[PDB]
Design a protein around this nucleic acid. Sequence first.
DNA 1: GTTGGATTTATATCATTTTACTAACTGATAGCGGAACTTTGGGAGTAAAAGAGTCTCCGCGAAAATGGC
Length: 110
Amino acid sequence: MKFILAEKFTFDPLSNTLIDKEDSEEIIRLGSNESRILWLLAQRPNEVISRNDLHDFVWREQGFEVDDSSLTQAISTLRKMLKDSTKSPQYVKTVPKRGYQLIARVETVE
DNA sequence: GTTGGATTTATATCATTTTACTAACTGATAGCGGAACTTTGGGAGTAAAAGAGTCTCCGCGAAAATGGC
């Protein structure tokens, strides 16, 4: 289960690797939390997801107990690693009081 | 012993909801003023001659302060 995002990135959650079409050799390392965040965004391409849903699905599976702002820190790190401008979002959008959005094109190879 | 990622605090910027202050419409209602009309209010007048008041009541006594001589 590997994804293509916005016709530019290749995302591997089983290996938590991010690959660029511009930089195929360069594979960037994303933490578990960011990988699970993007994985749920891909599992629901462009339908609005809820902050409780993300905190649950990410940290209820591993039994971790963290505060709500940890989700905000995870999204901030994902934004800095995706080189996505928060002012003009192209990959991840913040829908206030509803959660987040994956506006980029998502394709499922296999 | 350690150290670095992450899992929280720290500070700032952005978005959403509400407040503060506009205007326009709607609908009425009261108040004031004028014109007309009906009612009220004051005044003048009456040409046989007619030419002196009541007024019932009037079942009180003892003492003192007043004129009048």
